Structure formats: C-alpha cells, structure tokens
Amino acid sequence: DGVGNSSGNWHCDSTWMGDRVITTSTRTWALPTYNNHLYKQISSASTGASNDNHYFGYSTPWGYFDFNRFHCHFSPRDWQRLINNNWGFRPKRLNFKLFNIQVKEVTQNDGTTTIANNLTSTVQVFTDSEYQLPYVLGSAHQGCLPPFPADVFMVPQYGYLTLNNGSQAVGRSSFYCLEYFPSQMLRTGNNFTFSYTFEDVPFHSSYAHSQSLDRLMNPLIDQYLYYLSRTNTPSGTTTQSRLQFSQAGASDIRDQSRNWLPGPCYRQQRVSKTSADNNNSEYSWTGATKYHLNGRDSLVNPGPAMASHKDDEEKFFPQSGVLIFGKQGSEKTNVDIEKVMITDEEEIRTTNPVATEQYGSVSTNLQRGNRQAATADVNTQGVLPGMVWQDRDVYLQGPIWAKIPHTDGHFHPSPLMGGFGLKHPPPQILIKNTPVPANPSTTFSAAKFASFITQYSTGQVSVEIEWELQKENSKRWNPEIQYTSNYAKSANVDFTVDNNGVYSEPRPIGTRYLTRNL
Amino acid sequence: DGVGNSSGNWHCDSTWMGDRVITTSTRTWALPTYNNHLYKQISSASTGASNDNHYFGYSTPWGYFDFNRFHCHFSPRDWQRLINNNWGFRPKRLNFKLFNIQVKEVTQNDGTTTIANNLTSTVQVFTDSEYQLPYVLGSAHQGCLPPFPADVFMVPQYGYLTLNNGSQAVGRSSFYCLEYFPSQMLRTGNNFTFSYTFEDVPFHSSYAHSQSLDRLMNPLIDQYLYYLSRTNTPSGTTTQSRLQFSQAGASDIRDQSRNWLPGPCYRQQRVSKTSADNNNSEYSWTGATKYHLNGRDSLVNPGPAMASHKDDEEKFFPQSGVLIFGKQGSEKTNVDIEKVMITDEEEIRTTNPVATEQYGSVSTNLQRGNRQAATADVNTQGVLPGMVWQDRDVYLQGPIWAKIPHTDGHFHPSPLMGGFGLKHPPPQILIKNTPVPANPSTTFSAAKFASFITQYSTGQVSVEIEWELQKENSKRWNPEIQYTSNYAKSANVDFTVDNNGVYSEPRPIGTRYLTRNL
C-alpha cells in the first residue's frame, strides 16, 4: 500500500498435481517512454519500397506485455516431463500480475547521467477485454518474456497497420487513440491483477503415429473387392485388349481399396542443407511459393502442415515450409545456415504429404485406342471429403496461441505457425508512463507542451497458466522413443549458461515423441 | 491518501446506454505561478489605444479550468454518431475531478535547470457555486482542454475587466480578492470532486427543415381569400384605374396569404472568398456592422442567426456574420483566407433571412394619383408577433454554453455564438499554487516577502457529462443526408495525427443533417 511495503512475492514455481499442471513465472521489466508521448503515423513513403512492401500505420507511446511463447512458462526440464509422459495438453486458466513498480527520473545536466526515484509519478495500465484494438500478439514478434528467469527485458512498443493504397491511406483506414479507454493508474505501492479463462479448445496432439495411412490393412487376409490388374493380353502372338480383374492382398499392397485420403498440399520448392546440391541461380523470391492478395503477392510461411522430407533424405527441407529459429547471438540479416536451427516435421508424414513432392496424379483425357491414356500431376490439392491430416508441431521456442480473425467463414481454425486458435485470446495488456511536464513559462500559451521530464519505470510481472493434460495409456510391449540429453561429456551443458553468463538453447524441441495407433 | 497510493483512475470512455449518453474525458495539466503571487491592475493606459479599445481590470495569481468546448467531450466518431441519429440533445448532469497532484520545485542555481518534487507543498482549489465572481467562461477564450486526449495543456490565468472611463476606473468599479473565499487545500495524495446538475434547458435542434416557410401550402387546392391583382385596365384605348381582385393558387405562388413571418435581421456586408470580386478599399472597420454602447462602438460578432448566402452563390459570406475557426498551426495576426475554415449556415435559410440581403420592403407614402406609390427597404427588423426563427448552429469546435446575464429583462436567452443559455452555469473552478517563502532574514522586518521558491504543479483532470438525446422518428421514404468521411485515398486520414505527431481537424462539423417538416 505504501512506499515501504512490498506489493508482491516472487513465485516462479510449478506444481504437477493430477492431470493438471500449473506453471508460474516472474520477470523484471523496464519501460522507456516511446515516441516522446506522441502518436505518429508511419509508412513506406520515401523508402523506395516495392509494391509488395508498402504499408501505412501508426506507432503509439504505449507498450505491451507478450507471454505468448512456451519457454516463458516452461523450463527445459518441465518440457520433457510434459512431452515424454503425455498425449496432449491445453491451457485452462490464466492469471497475471504487475507489482513493485518503480518510476525513475533521469538527469543529463552535467553530461553525466543521474537517476533518482519519483514517488508521486504513475504508470497507467489497461487490458483490452472487449477486443477493440488491433490484436498484435499473434505474429511471433520479439519482445516476449525471456527464456531464463534471471534476465531483465524491455517492454516492446505498440503499433499497428491499417489499410493502405501504396503509401497512402485508403480512407476506410481507422485510427485508435489508446488514451480513450479506461485505464488504471498505478503508483509505487499499487499492483495490478486480472484473471482469464480459456474457452474449450482441442488438446494438442503430442503423439506421433505407429502406422501409416497407407497400411491400415491386415496383411494376412485378402480383400473381397476387385481392381483392374491387366488391360491387355499376350494372347494371339500379339497384344490385344482384354480387361482382367484381380483381388488385392499383401502381394500387391498398393492396389487395395482404402477408406481415407492424405491431407491437403500446397507445394514448396526443395533446397538442401548441403551447399553443393543447390542451384547457383537466385531463386529465393522467384522460385518461392506465393499467394496473391489485392494485387500484391506475399510469401507463404510456414504454410499448411506438410512433411519436410521423404524417408531417405534428411538434408532436404522445403524452402518456405519450416519454422527456422536462430541460435543465441545470431544477427538479423544474411546469416549462414550454421547460425540457424531448422525444425524437422518428419513425424507427420504418416498422414500429411511431403511438402516438396506432388500430391498425386490425375487422368487428363479420355482414351479410345486411337489415343493413349494420359495423366497430369497434382501440385495443389484442396480438401476433399474423407481426408485426414495432422496439425503442425508445437515447439518450446514457438508461439502458444493465435487469434482467429473475425470473419464470415473459416476452415479448421488451427493456426499455421502452430498453437491454439482462439476466438477470444488472452487480452492485450498495454502500459505507459504518464507524462510529467517540465516547468512551463510564467506567461500563458496555448501550444501543447514539447518539454517533459525524462523518466522510465521498472517492476515485476508474474504470469500463471493452468494446463490440462491427457495422460498416456499405451499397451505396446517395446519401449517408446523419449527425449533425452546426450550423456557424453561436453564443454558446456545444454540449456545452461556459459562462463560469460549467456543462456543458450542448443536445438528446438518438438512436442511429439510418444506414439499412437492411427 | 498517501504518497505511494494513487488518487484516481483514468476514465476516458463513453457509454451510449438508452436515450442517455455519458461522455467522460481525462487530461493532464500543468499550472505555473502567475504574476509572482501578486494581484495587479491592468489597463490600456500608455498603449495609445483608441476610445473603443480602452479597458480597466485586474489580473490574479489564480488559474481556471475551461471544458466549455464540445470537442473536449466528444471524439469525431462520437460526434457523428450523435448528429446522424438524433434530432436534439441537452446536457443533464456533470461531474468533475482533480487527482494525482504533484508539486515540483525548480532550481536555476548552476544555470542548469533542476527539478525535484515537494511532498509537503499544497495547491488550493475552490469552485464558485454562488456566482459572486465575474464569469469569464462564456467568451470563447483559448485554454480549454485539448481536443486529443494525448495532449498536455497549461491552465490559463484568471482575470477580469470592470467599469472604466478611458483608462481610469469609474469608482463604481469593484475589486475581488480570490483569497477571501473558502478553498480546499490539496496535497499529493488528496483529490477534489464536485457534481453539478443542469437546469431544464431546451433541446438543441439537430434537424434541418424539409420545406421553406414560404411554401406551406397545398399546391393543388386554391385559397378562398382574395388579393389585389391589378390596379388598372387597358379599357378605353388608354389606362384607367380599376381594382381587380384574384384568388391565389399554384399559378401565383407568391401572392397567397400566410400565417407566419421569417425571423428578424440585422444586416451584414457581403464579401466573397474570391479575391477578385471584393472591393479594393479598406472597409473592414468602416463598412462593418456595429452597435454603439456608452459612446464607444463595437463590432457585432457573430450577431443574430441569419443565413450565410442565397441558393446559387456559395462563395459569398457575411463580413462579421459567421464563426471563423483556424486550421492547425494558424498564426494570430493577418492570416490569409486559406489558413482559416469558415462555417456555413445555409441550412437555416428555410426560416431565417439571408444575412447580406434586406428583410423586405415597406410602403413609404400615401398615394393619390398626383403621387405614385413608393417603397423603402427594411435593413433592420425587430421581432414582430408571428415570427419564427432558428437558433445558430452548434459545432464540434464551438462553445457548449453561456451564462445569461442577470438583468431585469432579456429576450430568447439563447446565446449568439450558439449553445445553451444558462442562468446558473457550471461553476468556475479556480486553482492556485500556495506560496512558499524563501529563507527570511534573521532580523525582523515588516515588509512583505518579495522572494519565493519557484514551483509549479501538475495533475489529472476528469470531466464527465451526461447528455439526454431526442431520437429521430422519420417517416420519409428516401434516404437522409448523413455526415460521411470521403472514401478516396489520401496522404493523411482526417481527424488524425500526422507523421510528426500533430493532431489536426480538417473542417468544422455542424450539428444539423437530419431533416424534419417545418
């Protein structure tokens, strides 16, 4: 309540209880004043950007809290306790706190920097629970809570894009003043909480499949259905056309009748981790896989969920089709392939097609016998009745949820980066330093203040998510594949700080190890 | 209550409920010390001012809060939600708050500026609910709350004028010491509220009229009254005087008998937005429309409510007759016509006369037949029995109310700038920094202190007005005229910040779009 009392305790613990698990994490943040308390419009004007790259929007003084990655809520140990023992999980209930707020004035007067507290000054915070603001949290931006609890992070700036024609605004474009919403003004000794309940969402699938969609049959027994085995006969010392039918069994395993089809496909170009096997031309944009919306084409990432590679070839991956994470200390632009860690989706190829390969072939024409039969290959395939597929995998470094756009129709809302699609997601929490004016002139003037006190605020943030689990019940005799750390000696333990204090994550960890019958 | 607790939350929201609408807005202010805590008398002496320009008055250390413009309480979106859907509105109930006060000392010692808080020092505030002080809030002065919620404003200085003869005081002039009233002394951690109820006032009229006061007739049917159509006859190969009477119908639509007359007029000079069509002389003051009070003539602005122009001519406007607003970043003196936005009253010409045109004509003399009939034109017309008129329009940038002077008589108290005339308006809120002396000498002296600590205060102000609405019920078949933003593309959305952060309002928005039967 006061200056000397503490607003809240540090709770980083997690409790695994029953089929529930409750993860909690606390961090320390610092909030600068952005834009000098000004709303500004931003655009691609004067930049000389290509038609695909134009945008129009506004940047705000506000900043927002992003907890939308998994490693915020899970340690590497709590993550393998999750994925080794469980078939699925979903979030249930959420809880959020800000406490121990401190505002601090800065003084450059001497050329030295001088910092002192300010006990009176405030920080104002509102959560958008009615979803009027543009929702930014689903784009996989930087600025989320740090992986490792000992790190202090800076709160990112809020901003949004609206409709544009070129660099210009459309006129149906909208402008939001965030000052126009009810806020709670916090001072040192005040705290902020709210709680949120997730709506019912499907469990994520942490299993793989034990058997492919091709082979669901009993190999011993034979089918009672027939297929067309032979169109012609050697009879007559020359070939003549006669239709024979055969009955499909383990001898011909590819000819059997089946109830189900593989999932859909939108085809990708194939590149190899080996530098020699790739072509020497620049195909990066031209050979890419694009969609065309309102006269400007954008790249498809990652796209619909599809297998990365076939059985044999581990080195190939789809150009735009996989999630690519950077290693600790990776620069922004034109980093070599050794500086990034590429995810591998190959557990999913039991059902889904391979990203680089075609979906199938289809008859092009009618045959007569003046004309041979011809087929063409299907690169793009939309959903058909009787198709089954798996959603993309969830990673410890990846996004938890996305907001389902509000539209007349959508099909299978699961997001393409992975995670849980939500109609009402966890709301945005926006936070800003309240402006404090520098001394005004003694005579009156109607122009607004351009002079303020330089200040910033710090504090503690605590997020608590309750997860529901689906326990593995598996009758297989032989042992599962598990996620394990290699027992060999190393100069550095993985998922650990180094002698300079830097925390690094060596490789991405998918969520599907345990196996289950298709 | 304390230093660490917060005095109040930020509420800027508005709720449209039923026929009520409740608008709320919060701003940040800064209050300098004015005059060095001294009451001073001011006058036109030594300035060399013309007889019309003399004044005598007092300036005070105090400052006051002015919320008396509409765009303080309405966003541009909430304003068109108002004017498109509603025939009328009036204010009902008001609520006011000051909170999160901060007083700050200033130090120039090094030639650098140094600012620190002062937790002990106070700020004293009183509201004048008995209306003893001269009421300044009705003159459309600068210093009102900013349009856009992100702006910090400086509280304007309080002062008033009293009776003068030339630069000298009359002796019936009065002097008010504002220290002589009960005040509430606020310190950081204290807040100030009061609530106010408007007395019953007519709804403003947000409709226009569907039909002119000339044409109220049924065009199909004929009247049973007669008028004098012809005074003479061709009969006799020459003209002789014979009175014929005719019966008025759609054939002669101007001759019918009518129950009502147009509103009154006080005539204006006509100028054109086209620079070429105006005269080259300086008529600005000499050709103006003036009233003469106590031996000094002042200009009439805007004057009684009158139409701006006739049907055809959009470029002409009355010299003093319209409200003229400045565009963002318009200087004080001698700005060109492109820097100001001129209001257009033409929706009102269904009833009221055109400002530049005459009211009518009137018979000058008696006729005999040695003497022809003569008429003269009526430039000024006072109210007659059976006259109907419309009040001047309300704008988003304009004043909400005015105080009706306390006098033996007044006619139709509606103010001439527009808005609601009130006998008891919302009271004035006056605020001042309490003086803190600099160290006195150790020996005693009876002279008052000329030395003080330099300090100023800041805080938050929140105004909440409840409005009553009159919903549109209209049976017309075809669509209304609505207020719309143009859908064409533009470099800047209107009513929006620009890339430098400056908020601008492109054009004035009147309140009357919907139409209604006269």
Side-chain angles (χ1 to χ4, degrees), chain B residues 130-152:
Chain B
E130 300 301 318
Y131 301 95
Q132 293 99 355
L133 295 175
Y135 187 85
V136 168
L137 295 177
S139 295
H141 294 293
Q142 294 173 334
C144 192
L145 304 177
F148 183 70
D151 296 346
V152 176

PDB file of all heavy atoms in Angstrom, chain B residues 130-152:
ATOM      1  N   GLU B 130     -21.819  30.152  -5.845  1.00  0.00           N
ATOM      2  CA  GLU B 130     -22.764  31.224  -5.601  1.00  0.00           C
ATOM      3  C   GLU B 130     -22.643  32.343  -6.617  1.00  0.00           C
ATOM      4  O   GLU B 130     -23.393  33.316  -6.538  1.00  0.00           O
ATOM      5  CB  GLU B 130     -22.573  31.761  -4.189  1.00  0.00           C
ATOM      6  CG  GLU B 130     -22.787  30.715  -3.120  1.00  0.00           C
ATOM      7  CD  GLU B 130     -24.171  30.106  -3.170  1.00  0.00           C
ATOM      8  OE1 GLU B 130     -25.153  30.857  -3.363  1.00  0.00           O
ATOM      9  OE2 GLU B 130     -24.279  28.870  -3.029  1.00  0.00           O
ATOM     10  N   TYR B 131     -21.700  32.232  -7.546  1.00  0.00           N
ATOM     11  CA  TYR B 131     -21.598  33.117  -8.700  1.00  0.00           C
ATOM     12  C   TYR B 131     -21.300  34.556  -8.296  1.00  0.00           C
ATOM     13  O   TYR B 131     -21.816  35.500  -8.891  1.00  0.00           O
ATOM     14  CB  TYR B 131     -22.859  33.044  -9.559  1.00  0.00           C
ATOM     15  CG  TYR B 131     -23.125  31.657 -10.067  1.00  0.00           C
ATOM     16  CD1 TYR B 131     -23.982  30.809  -9.393  1.00  0.00           C
ATOM     17  CD2 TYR B 131     -22.509  31.189 -11.210  1.00  0.00           C
ATOM     18  CE1 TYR B 131     -24.216  29.540  -9.842  1.00  0.00           C
ATOM     19  CE2 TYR B 131     -22.738  29.916 -11.663  1.00  0.00           C
ATOM     20  CZ  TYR B 131     -23.591  29.100 -10.976  1.00  0.00           C
ATOM     21  OH  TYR B 131     -23.823  27.831 -11.428  1.00  0.00           O
ATOM     22  N   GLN B 132     -20.452  34.734  -7.284  1.00  0.00           N
ATOM     23  CA  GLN B 132     -20.038  36.087  -6.939  1.00  0.00           C
ATOM     24  C   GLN B 132     -18.936  36.611  -7.845  1.00  0.00           C
ATOM     25  O   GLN B 132     -18.794  37.825  -7.994  1.00  0.00           O
ATOM     26  CB  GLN B 132     -19.563  36.178  -5.496  1.00  0.00           C
ATOM     27  CG  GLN B 132     -20.611  35.961  -4.437  1.00  0.00           C
ATOM     28  CD  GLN B 132     -20.582  34.575  -3.878  1.00  0.00           C
ATOM     29  OE1 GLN B 132     -19.834  33.726  -4.343  1.00  0.00           O
ATOM     30  NE2 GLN B 132     -21.354  34.350  -2.831  1.00  0.00           N
ATOM     31  N   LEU B 133     -18.159  35.753  -8.432  1.00  0.00           N
ATOM     32  CA  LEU B 133     -17.055  36.250  -9.226  1.00  0.00           C
ATOM     33  C   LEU B 133     -17.499  36.574 -10.646  1.00  0.00           C
ATOM     34  O   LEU B 133     -18.456  35.990 -11.152  1.00  0.00           O
ATOM     35  CB  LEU B 133     -15.947  35.222  -9.275  1.00  0.00           C
ATOM     36  CG  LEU B 133     -15.343  34.982  -7.911  1.00  0.00           C
ATOM     37  CD1 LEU B 133     -14.331  33.879  -7.989  1.00  0.00           C
ATOM     38  CD2 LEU B 133     -14.714  36.264  -7.463  1.00  0.00           C
ATOM     39  N   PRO B 134     -16.821  37.504 -11.307  1.00  0.00           N
ATOM     40  CA  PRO B 134     -17.085  37.728 -12.728  1.00  0.00           C
ATOM     41  C   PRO B 134     -16.885  36.443 -13.510  1.00  0.00           C
ATOM     42  O   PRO B 134     -15.883  35.752 -13.349  1.00  0.00           O
ATOM     43  CB  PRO B 134     -16.055  38.791 -13.106  1.00  0.00           C
ATOM     44  CG  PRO B 134     -15.791  39.492 -11.850  1.00  0.00           C
ATOM     45  CD  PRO B 134     -15.845  38.465 -10.782  1.00  0.00           C
ATOM     46  N   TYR B 135     -17.853  36.118 -14.354  1.00  0.00           N
ATOM     47  CA  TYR B 135     -17.890  34.831 -15.028  1.00  0.00           C
ATOM     48  C   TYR B 135     -17.245  34.989 -16.397  1.00  0.00           C
ATOM     49  O   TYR B 135     -17.787  35.662 -17.275  1.00  0.00           O
ATOM     50  CB  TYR B 135     -19.321  34.334 -15.154  1.00  0.00           C
ATOM     51  CG  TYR B 135     -19.429  32.942 -15.687  1.00  0.00           C
ATOM     52  CD1 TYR B 135     -19.335  31.860 -14.843  1.00  0.00           C
ATOM     53  CD2 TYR B 135     -19.600  32.707 -17.034  1.00  0.00           C
ATOM     54  CE1 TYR B 135     -19.431  30.595 -15.313  1.00  0.00           C
ATOM     55  CE2 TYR B 135     -19.692  31.438 -17.514  1.00  0.00           C
ATOM     56  CZ  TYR B 135     -19.606  30.386 -16.647  1.00  0.00           C
ATOM     57  OH  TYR B 135     -19.693  29.104 -17.109  1.00  0.00           O
ATOM     58  N   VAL B 136     -16.079  34.373 -16.570  1.00  0.00           N
ATOM     59  CA  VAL B 136     -15.286  34.516 -17.783  1.00  0.00           C
ATOM     60  C   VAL B 136     -15.511  33.403 -18.809  1.00  0.00           C
ATOM     61  O   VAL B 136     -15.188  33.592 -19.991  1.00  0.00           O
ATOM     62  CB  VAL B 136     -13.800  34.612 -17.383  1.00  0.00           C
ATOM     63  CG1 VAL B 136     -12.906  34.463 -18.554  1.00  0.00           C
ATOM     64  CG2 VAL B 136     -13.545  35.941 -16.708  1.00  0.00           C
ATOM     65  N   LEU B 137     -16.152  32.304 -18.429  1.00  0.00           N
ATOM     66  CA  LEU B 137     -16.106  31.104 -19.255  1.00  0.00           C
ATOM     67  C   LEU B 137     -16.914  31.196 -20.541  1.00  0.00           C
ATOM     68  O   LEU B 137     -16.858  30.259 -21.342  1.00  0.00           O
ATOM     69  CB  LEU B 137     -16.587  29.903 -18.457  1.00  0.00           C
ATOM     70  CG  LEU B 137     -15.704  29.539 -17.279  1.00  0.00           C
ATOM     71  CD1 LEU B 137     -16.319  28.384 -16.531  1.00  0.00           C
ATOM     72  CD2 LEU B 137     -14.326  29.193 -17.779  1.00  0.00           C
ATOM     73  N   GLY B 138     -17.662  32.267 -20.768  1.00  0.00           N
ATOM     74  CA  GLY B 138     -18.534  32.341 -21.918  1.00  0.00           C
ATOM     75  C   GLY B 138     -18.013  33.100 -23.118  1.00  0.00           C
ATOM     76  O   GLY B 138     -18.774  33.309 -24.069  1.00  0.00           O
ATOM     77  N   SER B 139     -16.757  33.526 -23.117  1.00  0.00           N
ATOM     78  CA  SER B 139     -16.243  34.412 -24.149  1.00  0.00           C
ATOM     79  C   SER B 139     -15.482  33.703 -25.261  1.00  0.00           C
ATOM     80  O   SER B 139     -14.921  34.381 -26.123  1.00  0.00           O
ATOM     81  CB  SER B 139     -15.357  35.476 -23.520  1.00  0.00           C
ATOM     82  OG  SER B 139     -16.130  36.300 -22.672  1.00  0.00           O
ATOM     83  N   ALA B 140     -15.430  32.373 -25.252  1.00  0.00           N
ATOM     84  CA  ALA B 140     -14.727  31.599 -26.275  1.00  0.00           C
ATOM     85  C   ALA B 140     -13.230  31.900 -26.285  1.00  0.00           C
ATOM     86  O   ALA B 140     -12.634  32.167 -27.326  1.00  0.00           O
ATOM     87  CB  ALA B 140     -15.336  31.829 -27.657  1.00  0.00           C
ATOM     88  N   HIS B 141     -12.627  31.878 -25.103  1.00  0.00           N
ATOM     89  CA  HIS B 141     -11.188  32.016 -24.972  1.00  0.00           C
ATOM     90  C   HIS B 141     -10.463  30.692 -25.176  1.00  0.00           C
ATOM     91  O   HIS B 141     -11.013  29.608 -24.983  1.00  0.00           O
ATOM     92  CB  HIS B 141     -10.816  32.589 -23.614  1.00  0.00           C
ATOM     93  CG  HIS B 141     -11.266  33.996 -23.419  1.00  0.00           C
ATOM     94  ND1 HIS B 141     -10.743  35.043 -24.142  1.00  0.00           N
ATOM     95  CD2 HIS B 141     -12.179  34.532 -22.583  1.00  0.00           C
ATOM     96  CE1 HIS B 141     -11.322  36.165 -23.766  1.00  0.00           C
ATOM     97  NE2 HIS B 141     -12.197  35.883 -22.820  1.00  0.00           N
ATOM     98  N   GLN B 142      -9.200  30.808 -25.562  1.00  0.00           N
ATOM     99  CA  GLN B 142      -8.270  29.696 -25.577  1.00  0.00           C
ATOM    100  C   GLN B 142      -7.988  29.216 -24.159  1.00  0.00           C
ATOM    101  O   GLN B 142      -8.288  29.889 -23.175  1.00  0.00           O
ATOM    102  CB  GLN B 142      -6.967  30.111 -26.239  1.00  0.00           C
ATOM    103  CG  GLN B 142      -7.099  30.420 -27.689  1.00  0.00           C
ATOM    104  CD  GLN B 142      -5.836  30.981 -28.252  1.00  0.00           C
ATOM    105  OE1 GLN B 142      -5.037  31.565 -27.534  1.00  0.00           O
ATOM    106  NE2 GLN B 142      -5.635  30.806 -29.542  1.00  0.00           N
ATOM    107  N   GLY B 143      -7.423  28.021 -24.058  1.00  0.00           N
ATOM    108  CA  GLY B 143      -7.080  27.455 -22.772  1.00  0.00           C
ATOM    109  C   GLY B 143      -7.996  26.347 -22.331  1.00  0.00           C
ATOM    110  O   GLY B 143      -7.835  25.832 -21.221  1.00  0.00           O
ATOM    111  N   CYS B 144      -8.957  25.980 -23.160  1.00  0.00           N
ATOM    112  CA  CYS B 144      -9.821  24.852 -22.898  1.00  0.00           C
ATOM    113  C   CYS B 144      -9.032  23.555 -23.070  1.00  0.00           C
ATOM    114  O   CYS B 144      -7.932  23.541 -23.623  1.00  0.00           O
ATOM    115  CB  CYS B 144     -11.027  24.924 -23.831  1.00  0.00           C
ATOM    116  SG  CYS B 144     -12.394  23.833 -23.464  1.00  0.00           S
ATOM    117  N   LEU B 145      -9.583  22.463 -22.541  1.00  0.00           N
ATOM    118  CA  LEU B 145      -8.962  21.147 -22.639  1.00  0.00           C
ATOM    119  C   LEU B 145      -8.631  20.843 -24.093  1.00  0.00           C
ATOM    120  O   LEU B 145      -9.371  21.258 -24.991  1.00  0.00           O
ATOM    121  CB  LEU B 145      -9.885  20.060 -22.103  1.00  0.00           C
ATOM    122  CG  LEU B 145     -10.429  20.138 -20.687  1.00  0.00           C
ATOM    123  CD1 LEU B 145     -11.366  18.974 -20.454  1.00  0.00           C
ATOM    124  CD2 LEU B 145      -9.337  20.135 -19.682  1.00  0.00           C
ATOM    125  N   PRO B 146      -7.542  20.137 -24.368  1.00  0.00           N
ATOM    126  CA  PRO B 146      -7.152  19.885 -25.746  1.00  0.00           C
ATOM    127  C   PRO B 146      -8.127  18.945 -26.427  1.00  0.00           C
ATOM    128  O   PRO B 146      -8.813  18.158 -25.762  1.00  0.00           O
ATOM    129  CB  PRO B 146      -5.773  19.235 -25.600  1.00  0.00           C
ATOM    130  CG  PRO B 146      -5.297  19.678 -24.290  1.00  0.00           C
ATOM    131  CD  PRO B 146      -6.504  19.699 -23.431  1.00  0.00           C
ATOM    132  N   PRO B 147      -8.221  19.001 -27.754  1.00  0.00           N
ATOM    133  CA  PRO B 147      -9.118  18.078 -28.457  1.00  0.00           C
ATOM    134  C   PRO B 147      -8.742  16.626 -28.268  1.00  0.00           C
ATOM    135  O   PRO B 147      -9.605  15.789 -27.991  1.00  0.00           O
ATOM    136  CB  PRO B 147      -8.961  18.504 -29.919  1.00  0.00           C
ATOM    137  CG  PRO B 147      -8.430  19.870 -29.863  1.00  0.00           C
ATOM    138  CD  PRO B 147      -7.551  19.913 -28.685  1.00  0.00           C
ATOM    139  N   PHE B 148      -7.474  16.316 -28.395  1.00  0.00           N
ATOM    140  CA  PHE B 148      -6.954  14.968 -28.497  1.00  0.00           C
ATOM    141  C   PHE B 148      -6.379  14.528 -27.165  1.00  0.00           C
ATOM    142  O   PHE B 148      -5.538  15.234 -26.602  1.00  0.00           O
ATOM    143  CB  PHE B 148      -5.890  14.914 -29.581  1.00  0.00           C
ATOM    144  CG  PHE B 148      -5.341  13.556 -29.825  1.00  0.00           C
ATOM    145  CD1 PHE B 148      -6.120  12.588 -30.413  1.00  0.00           C
ATOM    146  CD2 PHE B 148      -4.035  13.261 -29.526  1.00  0.00           C
ATOM    147  CE1 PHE B 148      -5.624  11.342 -30.648  1.00  0.00           C
ATOM    148  CE2 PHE B 148      -3.535  12.017 -29.773  1.00  0.00           C
ATOM    149  CZ  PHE B 148      -4.326  11.058 -30.330  1.00  0.00           C
ATOM    150  N   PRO B 149      -6.808  13.380 -26.640  1.00  0.00           N
ATOM    151  CA  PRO B 149      -6.548  13.065 -25.229  1.00  0.00           C
ATOM    152  C   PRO B 149      -5.086  12.954 -24.857  1.00  0.00           C
ATOM    153  O   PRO B 149      -4.771  12.971 -23.664  1.00  0.00           O
ATOM    154  CB  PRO B 149      -7.260  11.723 -25.046  1.00  0.00           C
ATOM    155  CG  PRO B 149      -8.312  11.728 -26.063  1.00  0.00           C
ATOM    156  CD  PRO B 149      -7.725  12.412 -27.246  1.00  0.00           C
ATOM    157  N   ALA B 150      -4.182  12.836 -25.820  1.00  0.00           N
ATOM    158  CA  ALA B 150      -2.775  12.632 -25.520  1.00  0.00           C
ATOM    159  C   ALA B 150      -2.024  13.922 -25.249  1.00  0.00           C
ATOM    160  O   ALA B 150      -0.806  13.880 -25.059  1.00  0.00           O
ATOM    161  CB  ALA B 150      -2.094  11.889 -26.666  1.00  0.00           C
ATOM    162  N   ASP B 151      -2.699  15.061 -25.235  1.00  0.00           N
ATOM    163  CA  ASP B 151      -2.032  16.348 -25.139  1.00  0.00           C
ATOM    164  C   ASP B 151      -2.068  16.870 -23.710  1.00  0.00           C
ATOM    165  O   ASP B 151      -3.044  16.668 -22.986  1.00  0.00           O
ATOM    166  CB  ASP B 151      -2.686  17.354 -26.080  1.00  0.00           C
ATOM    167  CG  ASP B 151      -2.543  16.961 -27.533  1.00  0.00           C
ATOM    168  OD1 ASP B 151      -1.718  16.074 -27.829  1.00  0.00           O
ATOM    169  OD2 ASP B 151      -3.256  17.537 -28.381  1.00  0.00           O
ATOM    170  N   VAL B 152      -0.990  17.536 -23.309  1.00  0.00           N
ATOM    171  CA  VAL B 152      -0.896  18.188 -22.010  1.00  0.00           C
ATOM    172  C   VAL B 152      -1.085  19.681 -22.214  1.00  0.00           C
ATOM    173  O   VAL B 152      -0.461  20.273 -23.101  1.00  0.00           O
ATOM    174  CB  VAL B 152       0.452  17.894 -21.338  1.00  0.00           C
ATOM    175  CG1 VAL B 152       0.566  18.660 -20.053  1.00  0.00           C
ATOM    176  CG2 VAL B 152       0.595  16.416 -21.088  1.00  0.00           C
TER     177      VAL B 152
END
